[PDB]
Amino acid sequence: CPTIKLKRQWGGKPSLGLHYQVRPIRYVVIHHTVTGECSGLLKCAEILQNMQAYHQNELDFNDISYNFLIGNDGIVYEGTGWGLRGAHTYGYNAIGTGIAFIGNFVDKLPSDAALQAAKDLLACGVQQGELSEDYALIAGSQVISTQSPGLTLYNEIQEWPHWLSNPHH
């Protein structure tokens, strides 16, 4: 079970509005940030802080759009966190957990540590009752008009158990 970097622990601002999710959650949506990569708290916190500010100020979201975000270091950074609605995926915020790999993975994969942290996050979520034992894992590109999480990353995750090939758009 990965130790999650909580919101305060990376210097993030409190959410401007809470919307509680049903438990358990049935969909996990995978994204990339279309940002540079990062490792370690110092560079990861800068990106997340700027991203949250952009989401709250320019995009009018209550908080950083993703539920969780994962760095090259293989640490899971709390975005909206478990049980709270983000704004990462149209039609899948209330009923989904949005997980973004930090970086751009059209042409490359995230680090092995990032990929393993993600699998651990999903298994622990099932174990803790955060996710349905038969949760569906999907790419953002399956359900909204986007390339996220990037073709290469997309090719990776369609091989994990729980991948669902036909989620509703």
Residue numbers in the entry: 11 to 179
Sentences from the paper on this structure:
We have determined the crystal structure of PGRP-SA to 2.2-Å resolution and analyzed its peptidoglycan (PG) recognition and signaling activities. The crystal structure was determined by molecular replacement, using the structure of PGRP-LB as a search model. Although the crystals were grown from full-length PGRP-SA (177 residues plus 6×His-tag; residues numbered from the N terminus of the purified polypeptide chain, as determined by N-terminal sequencing), clear electron density was visible only from Cys11 to Pro177. The structure of PGRP-SA reveals a single domain composed of a central seven-stranded mixed β sheet (B1, B3, B4, B5, B7, B8, and B9) flanked by three major helices (H2, H3, and H5), a small two-stranded parallel β sheet (B2 and B6), and two single-turn helices (H1 and H4). The H2 helix contains one turn of rarely observed π helix at its C terminus (residues 64–70). This helix, together with the L1–L4 loops and the central β sheet, forms a prominent extended surface groove, which in PGRP-LB includes a zinc cage. However, PGRP-SA has lost two of the four zinc-coordinating residues present in PGRP-LB; accordingly, the rPGRP-SA crystals exhibit no X-ray absorption at the zinc edge, and we found no electron density for possible metal ions around the groove. PGRP-SA contains two disulfide bridges (Cys11-Cys134 and Cys48-Cys54), whereas PGRP-LB has only one. The most prominent feature of PGRP-SA is a long surface groove demarcated by residues of the H2 helix from one side and of the L1–L4 loops from the other side, with the residues from B3, B4, and B7 of the central β sheet forming the base of the groove. In the PGRP-SA structure the Oγ of the Ser158 residue is positioned within hydrogen-bonding distance (2.95 Å) of the Nδ1 of the highly conserved His42 residue.
